[PDB]
Amino acid sequence: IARTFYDGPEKNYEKTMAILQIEAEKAELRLKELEVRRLMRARGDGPWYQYPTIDKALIDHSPKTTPDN
């Protein structure tokens, strides 16, 4: 029965280790992502949460019929 239908314990052992490593990495990544999101929303210095500002290319840098603009 063991030869025909089942395998050794080493296979399940090492598969369990691989699964545990994947899940632990995923958990640490989720926590890190939450912290990064909080920091980016608080500060705004990162790529995320970059709300638009007025484009400076719309400014007209020409004499304005009045020296004091």
Ligand X SMILES: CCCCCCCCCCCCCCCCC[C@@H](O)O[C@H](CO[C@H](O)CCCCCCCCCCCCCCC)COP(=O)(O)OCC[N+](C)(C)C
Of ligand X, another protein, none, which one does residue 7 interact with (CB within 5 to 8 Å by kind)?
ligand X
3-class DSSP string for the chain: CHHHHCCCHHHHHHHHHHHHHHHHHHHHHHHHHHHHHHHHHHHCCCCCCCCCCCCHHHCCCCCCCCCCC
Q: Residue 6 or 49: which CB sits closer to ligand X?
A: 6
| The only residue of 47, 51, 53, 57 in contact with another protein, by rule CB under 8 A | 47
- 45 contact choice in another protein, ligand X, none (CB below 5 to 8 Å, kind-dependent): another protein
- The residues that touch ligand X, with contacts defined as CB under 6 A, are 5-7
